[PDB]
Amino acid sequence: NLTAAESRIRDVDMAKEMSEFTKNNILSQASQAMLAQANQQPQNVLQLLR
Amino acid sequence: NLTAAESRIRDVDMAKEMSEFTKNNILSQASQAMLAQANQQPQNVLQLLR
């Protein structure tokens, strides 16, 4: 029984944690895509200058 | 007569005790099979990771 409680504190439910891993990754990839879009505005500013 | 009483305390009825032997063994074998089933869940957890 103590093993059970120990595990409930210590052992992660790797199913849910896998889903959180998935999620955090795709949020990172998306975020990077948003950077790749963010940093393209200045070049049309240049098109106004050029 | 005292021999009879002695035996009733001391002498096991090996028929019944044989049946208990049978029983305890098959419970052990079954239990082990349940372990062999128990320890296969984590590998489908891996299939979620992999």
Side-chain angles (χ1 to χ4, degrees):
Chain A
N1 291 319
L2 296 174
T3 301
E6 180 185 2
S7 65
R8 289 189 297 274
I9 297 169
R10 294 179 67 188
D11 188 359
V12 65
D13 188 359
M14 293 183 285
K16 184 176 181 180
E17 185 66 25
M18 183 276 290
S19 66
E20 294 290 326
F21 181 72
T22 301
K23 182 174 73 175
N24 292 318
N25 290 315
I26 60 169
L27 295 173
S28 179
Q29 293 180 358
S31 297
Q32 292 185 2
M34 294 298 101
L35 182 63
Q37 297 292 321
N39 60 1
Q40 297 293 322
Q41 183 67 39
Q43 293 74 5
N44 294 321
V45 176
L46 295 174
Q47 293 177 356
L48 294 173
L49 294 174
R50 296 178 63 87
Chain B
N1 291 319
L2 296 174
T3 301
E6 180 185 2
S7 65
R8 289 189 297 274
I9 297 169
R10 294 179 67 188
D11 188 359
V12 65
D13 188 359
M14 293 183 285
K16 184 176 181 180
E17 185 66 25
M18 183 276 290
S19 66
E20 295 290 326
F21 181 72
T22 301
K23 182 174 73 175
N24 291 318
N25 290 315
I26 60 169
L27 295 173
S28 179
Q29 293 180 358
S31 297
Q32 292 185 2
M34 294 298 101
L35 182 63
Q37 297 292 321
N39 60 1
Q40 297 293 322
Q41 183 67 39
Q43 293 74 5
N44 294 321
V45 176
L46 295 174
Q47 293 177 356
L48 294 173
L49 294 174
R50 296 178 63 87

